[PDB]
Amino acid sequence: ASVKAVGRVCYSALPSQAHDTLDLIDEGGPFPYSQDGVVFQNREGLLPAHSTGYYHEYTVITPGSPTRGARRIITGQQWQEDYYTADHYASFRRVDFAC
Template sequence: MPTEKNISITKSLVLLTVSIVLAISLNQSVALAAVANDAVKAVAALIKSLGQSKNLLQEHQILLRQIGSKVDDFIPYLSSYPKDQRIVVLLGAAEQKGLIKPTEKLRWNHDLLNGKIDEDDLIEMLRANQSSEEVMKSVNAMIPKIKHDNLSSEARETLKLIDNGGPFPYAQDGTVFHNREGKLPTKSPHYYHEYTVKSSNSNGRGAQRIITGENGVKYFTDDHYQSFKEIKP
């Protein structure tokens, strides 16, 4: 009985034979080599693609079964995947946990790929066992924007220090901001960090701060966390 491997090889040889006959019939010796070479490449690429797809599918299924409430254990592993594949895995895990409805997955996938929803929000959903409705309330929180050039010179100077990694004027700079006032989107406990903006009219640290998030987002407050503006380029 012929094996699947033998059948596959036979099909490949048939494809090569047809290509060769076609080239000879056209009496084009150069085309003969090109067509035969393209056929070999096409067969090899197809076999490789099918093999990779199968392996990825198996890995995804294993991840979906194991992620559970320990999503942070899998973040380093998932980071080796392209963004679209990470999203497939994370959305599948959220559906399995009942955090997102099957009818919502397509919209979430679209919004995640287009930056309307941050991947960190999806991870937070799994980490905190939040429903999609709870996550979207945070995502859609109405936080006004302010352009970088419209900030005070002191605030822009603090941003430079943040980009350069210091040196910072206060020991509290770079410490975790716990968002106790709930004015910013709910994130993991160590997601936000705060930095002091020097105030010329204050002897102490004053009321101005810049808050940074792990995904690169930055906020400015001039009333000691009572209101925020998201800093845009």
């Protein structure tokens, strides 16, 4: 069933590549993978339900991966509403910018 909140991961605990990603989003790129910036549909309902176009996804590079890999940042529309998945969207944690 439904749950009241997504869990959290401290900004300081993210891998450094995720910090790089957040910076690339701020700077508008350049993005390493062609699917960077696409709309994320949130089809499994792991993140709060919103209309199509609320969320976008961006690669977080996995060191030594010859392919895109499993890590991503998903951005929401609200201030500081960034989510991290390290497992191809099987789970997310909301980035806590205060720690």
